[PDB]
Nucleic acid binder design. Structure first.
Ligand SMILES: Nc1nc2c(ncn2[C@H]2C[C@H](O)[C@@H](COP(=O)(O)OP(=O)(O)OP(=O)(O)O)O2)c(=O)[nH]1
Ligand SMILES: [Mg+2]
Ligand SMILES: [Mg+2]
Ligand SMILES: [Mg+2]
Length: 539
DNA sequence: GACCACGGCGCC
DNA sequence: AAACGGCGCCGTGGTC
């Protein structure tokens, strides 16, 4: 290309280099742009940011987040990663995308700009006549990228002092548990080392090894296995409790307070838009889509996520989402009628399986039932259903029997989905998002049947993901008008921040936007709550 | 110090 | 072991 002075013209493709991957923490090392046979390099990249009307190019969202951190409204536009990801969701990194579609991902802003221009041209070529993928790009993925940039840059308020205090107390309890483990072992060891634990449990003590590890074939010490040995030694109980405490302490309690950004005062995740095989988002650096919720300590941790003073959190979660999506995709008359009557399958399974009235069904129980409903649907074995439910074998075969043909056309849709996948090489969501599943005609049954369960899950998980993304796209400008913020997405859930005076209005409107995003043959329902913290906002 | 594979486990 | 699906992070044991 011709080297031309900085500033590029309207609509050039950007390239940039960050000191590190996290846009909120990164130094912008270099910036450049490409257009009309010219390349333009910024002499000082922070100043040069102000010249651009949009970030158009590879990883556009990340540059926009960094721009927003600097008080600049620089929205992300076209991004070839999104085109590639829609062509094939195994396109997840610029390294792979570059090499597949006609360049090389280097460490020089100018080359990255030139690469972005030609990859766009090429990937746009590959999408000619792909009307549905084009619809998803223009109506979902491209505008979603601007919403995620705003979410990332806003971050969430964390109660830091509280988490520090909690750490000091959890440490004393951890030392009580490990002292007693060491007393039962007859000696100390590194209890965090699963290899050392293996030796202690199965070689030194008498315990039977009920399982091997996948890749290396060691005797397993997972909670599944240790559940089996709960009565067979007291020590196991102590280990499981230690595991829980150390997991929560090392993953959330200790790292999160150290991630508060000094300028914003807030905690900033990244929402990765080309990371999953199904069209879902992921969250990283720190993952805020797996904050504990389940155990009493998990609940304590979740209370650390709070509203700014004068604001409240609003938490919205889709009811029974993939079950509703299934009703629509399959067209099953019985499953449709179940949601038309306002039934709750999760509560009904809990009630059945624990043998209590619905009124007594607690959150712990509801989660257990989810495992069963989604397990069975997505091809769980009779054997593994027996384990889990803790019941005989032929009963599980009959349960899986009872589950299907209660909903006869689910099976017919599973079969239809697999034959299209075998013939075309890919399966698709309601909106035409594709996933290529190559192993459907594999000759090794295990490899074939795993490919099958991945294949028929994707249209269901992926359609739910499509719906949520579209709701976000529709909701965001409505929130801006009302002076509220979108903070987090957790697959079928949004967490917003609203000024106290507008909180109820905001909750009502977001609920409606989420429920009416794309009408199906069953109603979507959204549970919404409002509170000072994330836990209290879902009660 | 970075990177890796693995087991294990938090959430959806 | 259990072969529901989709993720990312931790502490290991280990290499370079
Ligand atoms: N295959 C599978 N999918 C799951 C599992 N847990 C959650 N999901 C998927 C399916 C759910 O519909 C979706 C949203 O998770 P939620 O915790 O919100 O469950 P759901 O919305 O169905 O129930 P809810 O009515 O919100 O309590 O994520 C699981 O254990 N297996
Ligand atoms: Mg839900
Ligand atoms: Mg949810
Ligand atoms: Mg792994």
């Amino acid at each position: 290309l011709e080297e031309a002075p900085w500033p590029p013209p309207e609509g050039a493709f950007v390239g940039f280099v960050l000191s590190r991957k996290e846009p909120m923490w990164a130094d912008l090392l270099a910036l450049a742009a490409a257009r009309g046979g010219r390349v333009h390099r910024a002499p000082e990249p922070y100043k040069a940011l102000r010249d651009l009307k949009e970030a158009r190019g590879l990883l556009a969202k990340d540059l926009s987040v960094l721009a927003l951190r600097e008080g600049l409204g620089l929205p992300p536009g076209d991004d070839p990663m999104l085109l590639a990801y829609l062509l094939d969701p195994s396109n997840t990194t610029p390294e792979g995308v570059a090499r597949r579609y006609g360049g090389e991902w280097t460490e020089e802003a100018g080359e990255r700009a030139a690469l972005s221009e030609r990859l766009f041209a090429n990937l746009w070529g590959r999408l000619e006549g792909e009307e549905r993928l084009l619809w998803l790009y223009r109506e979902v993925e491209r505008p979603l990228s601007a919403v995620l940039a705003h979410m990332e840059a806003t971050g969430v308020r964390l109660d830091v002092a509280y988490l520090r205090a909690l750490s000091l107390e959890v440490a004393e309890e951890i030392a009580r548990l490990e002292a007693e483990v060491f007393r039962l072992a007859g000696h100390p060891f590194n209890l965090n080392s699963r290899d050392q634990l293996e030796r202690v449990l199965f070689d030194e003590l008498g315990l039977p090894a009920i399982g091997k590890t996948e890749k290396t074939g060691k005797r397993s010490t997972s909670a599944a296995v240790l559940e089996a040995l709960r009565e067979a030694h007291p020590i196991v109980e102590k280990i499981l409790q230690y595991r829980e405490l150390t997991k929560l302490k090392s993953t959330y309690i200790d790292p999160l307070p150290d991630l508060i950004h000094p300028r914003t005062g807030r905690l900033h995740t990244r929402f990765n838009q080309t990371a999953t095989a199904t069209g879902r988002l992921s969250s990283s650096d720190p993952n805020l889509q797996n904050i504990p919720v389940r155990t009493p300590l998990g609940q304590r941790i979740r209370r650390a996520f709070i509203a700014e003073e004068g604001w409240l959190l609003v938490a919205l979660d889709y009811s029974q989402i993939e079950l509703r999506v299934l009703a629509h995709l399959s067209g099953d008359e019985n499953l449709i009628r179940v949601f038309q009557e306002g039934r709750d399958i999760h509560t009904e399974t809990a009630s059945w399986m624990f043998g209590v009235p619905r009124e007594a069904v607690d959150p712990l129980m509801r989660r257990a039932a989810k495992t069963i409903n989604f397990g069975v649907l997505y091809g769980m074995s009779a054997h593994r259903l027996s384990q889990e439910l803790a019941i005989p074998y032929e009963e599980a075969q009959a349960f899986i029997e009872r589950y299907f043909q209660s909903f006869p056309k689910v099976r017919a849709w599973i079969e239809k989905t697999l034959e299209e996948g075998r013939r075309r090489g890919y399966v698709e969501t309601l909106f035409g998002r594709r996933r290529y599943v190559p192993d459907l005609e594999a000759r090794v049954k295990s490899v074939r049947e795993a490919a099958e369960r991945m294949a028929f899950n994707m249209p269901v998980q992926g359609t739910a993901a499509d719906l949520m993304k579209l709701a976000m796209v529709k909701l965001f400008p409505r929130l801006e008008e009302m002076g509220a913020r979108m903070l987090l997405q957790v697959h079928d859930e949004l967490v917003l921040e609203a000024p106290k005076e507008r909180a109820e209005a905001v909750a009502r409107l977001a609920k409606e936007v989420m429920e009416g995003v794309y009408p199906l043959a069953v109603p979507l329902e959204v549970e919404v709550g409002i509170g000072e913290d994330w836990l209290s906002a879902k009660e």
